[PDB]
């Protein structure tokens, strides 16, 4: 790696042989690292790097072609995606600064609650049935011999107050497991789905603790179109709503601690 060389040998004739392949592979990768996102949006802080450049060190790659399975469309990577929308205003005219959520941040659909418009279709299994469905349809699925049953437990909330009770849980045909919980909100008496990721258990009191949002927030949760299957579009917009709680369910959360 020295600037000047006075020594030559086979050992070193192969080392550089690697770095070249390396410097090349790292680029190969970078190219791929841009099949989702780029180009960038603004110029808040002029692309930083040993060598600036227009759009990174490596020019964007060629659109790959993804043939979804039967009864499916087609995806291209990368792809020219139409600009999204921001339901928030700039906390400051200075670039980089954050964007304050308008109205109730719990549903402003921004940041934590913000979710992209995923395909308004539904994921399926190998054969063609909706991958993720409620046990009210999964005639084969049963609770593991021994493990306590969730169906019937009362879903508590952040503040502690009860928000509703589980009426059913959504299992996954493709990958045997519990992914959602058909929760029955008390307030709106509606039926919203609850994601495992946020679903906590207290087998002692037959509950499904949730620190995401308050019991009251469970009310206006992104409803589902068909109660016999969850759409990818909504599915992602579902558990995203809970995320908001992770940062909006309480002014204290977003507020500093020190």
Partner 1 sequence: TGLTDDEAKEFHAIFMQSMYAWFGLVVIAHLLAWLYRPWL
Partner 2 sequence: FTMNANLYKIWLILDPRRVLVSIVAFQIVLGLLIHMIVLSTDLNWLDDNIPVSYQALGKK
Partner 3 sequence: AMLSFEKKYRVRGGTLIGGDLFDFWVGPFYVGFFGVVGFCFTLLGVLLIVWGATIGPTGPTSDLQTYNLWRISIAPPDLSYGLRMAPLTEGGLWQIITICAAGAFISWALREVEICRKLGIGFHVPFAFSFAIGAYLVLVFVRPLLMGAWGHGFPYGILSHLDWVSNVGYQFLHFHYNPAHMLAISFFFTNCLALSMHGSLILSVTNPQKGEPVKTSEHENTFFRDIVGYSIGALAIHRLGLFLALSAAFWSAVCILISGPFWTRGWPEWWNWWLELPLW
Chain residues that interact with partner 2, rule: CB under 8 A? 2-8, 10, 13, 16-17, 20, 43, 46-47, 50-54, 92, 94-96, 256-258
**Cα-based angle 190, 194, 199 (whole degrees, multiple of 5):** 140
Q: Which is nearer to partner 1, 94 or 258 (CB)?
A: 94
**Cα-based angle 238, 98, 44 (whole degrees, multiple of 5):** 120
Under the binding rule (CB under 8 A), the answer on residue 88 touching partner 3 is yes
Paired with 195 in beta bridges are 180
Question: End-to-end alpha-carbon separation of the chain, Å?
Answer: 48
Q: State which of positions 90-149 bind partner 3 (CB under 8 A).
A: 91-92, 94, 96-101, 110-112, 114, 116, 125-126
Q: Which is nearer to partner 1, 95 or 197 (CB)?
A: 95
**Taking Cα atoms as reference points, which of 200, 190, 63, 12 lies closest to residue 182?**
190
- Residues 77-116 as x/- pattern, contact with partner 1 by CB under 8 A: ---------------xxxx---------------------
Q: What sign does the CA torsion over 22, 28, 32, 34 have?
A: positive
Q: Which two tokens stand for residue 57?
A: 């060190």
Residues in the chain, overall count: 258
CB of 23 to partner 1, least distance (A): 26
Q: Which is nearer to partner 2, 1 or 71 (CB)?
A: 1
Rounded to a whole number of angstroms, the CA Rg of the chain reads 25
CB of 197 to partner 2, least distance (A): 28
Residue 16's binding partner, choosing from partner 1, partner 2, partner 3, none, with beta-carbon cut-off 5 to 8 A by kind?
A: partner 2
Residue 116's binding partner, choosing from partner 3, partner 2, partner 1, none, with beta-carbon cut-off 5 to 8 A by kind?
A: partner 3
Q: Which two tokens stand for residue 165?
A: 């009770």
Widest CA span of the chain, in angstroms? 82
Task: Classify strands 64-67 and 74-77 as parallel, antiparallel or unpaired.
Answer: antiparallel
The contact set with partner 3 (CB under 8 A) reads 1-2, 37-48, 64, 66-70, 72, 81, 84-86, 88, 91-92, 94, 96-101, 110-112, 114, 116, 125-126, 174-175, 177, 197, 243-244, 246-247, 253-258
The contact set with partner 1 (CB under 8 A) reads 92-95
């Amino acid at each position: 790696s020295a600037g000047i060389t006075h020594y030559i040998d086979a050992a070193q004739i192969t080392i550089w042989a690697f770095w070249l392949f390396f410097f090349g592979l790292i680029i190969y990768l970078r190219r791929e690292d841009k099949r989702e996102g780029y180009p960038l949006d603004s110029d808040r802080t002029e692309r930083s790097g040993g060598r600036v450049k227009v759009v990174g060190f490596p020019d964007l790659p060629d659109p790959k072609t993804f043939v979804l399975p039967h009864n499916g469309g087609t995806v291209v990577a990368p792809r020219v995606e139409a600009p999204v929308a921001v339901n928030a205003t700039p906390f400051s005219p200075a670039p980089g600064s954050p964007l304050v959520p308008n109205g109730d941040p719990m549903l402003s659909g921004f940041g934590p609650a913000a979710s992209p418009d995923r395909p308004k279709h539904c994921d399926l299994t190998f054969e063609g049935l909706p991958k993720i469905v409620p046990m009210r349809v999964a005639k084969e699925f049963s609770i593991a011999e021994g493990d306590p049953d969730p169906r019937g437990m009362t879903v508590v909330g952040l503040d502690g107050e009860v928000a509703g009770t589980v009426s059913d849980v959504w299992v996954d045909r493709s990958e045997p497991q519990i992914r959602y919980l058909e929760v029955e909100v008390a307030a709106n008496k509606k039926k919203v789905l609850l994601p495992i990721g946020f679903s906590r258990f207290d087998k002692k009191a037959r509950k499904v603790k949730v620190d995401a949002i308050k019991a009251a927030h469970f009310a206006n949760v992104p409803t589902l179109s068909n109660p016999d299957q969850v759409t990818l579009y909504e599915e992602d917009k579902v558990c995203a709503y809970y995320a908001g709680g992770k940062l909006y369910a309480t002014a204290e959360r977003a507020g500093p601690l020190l």
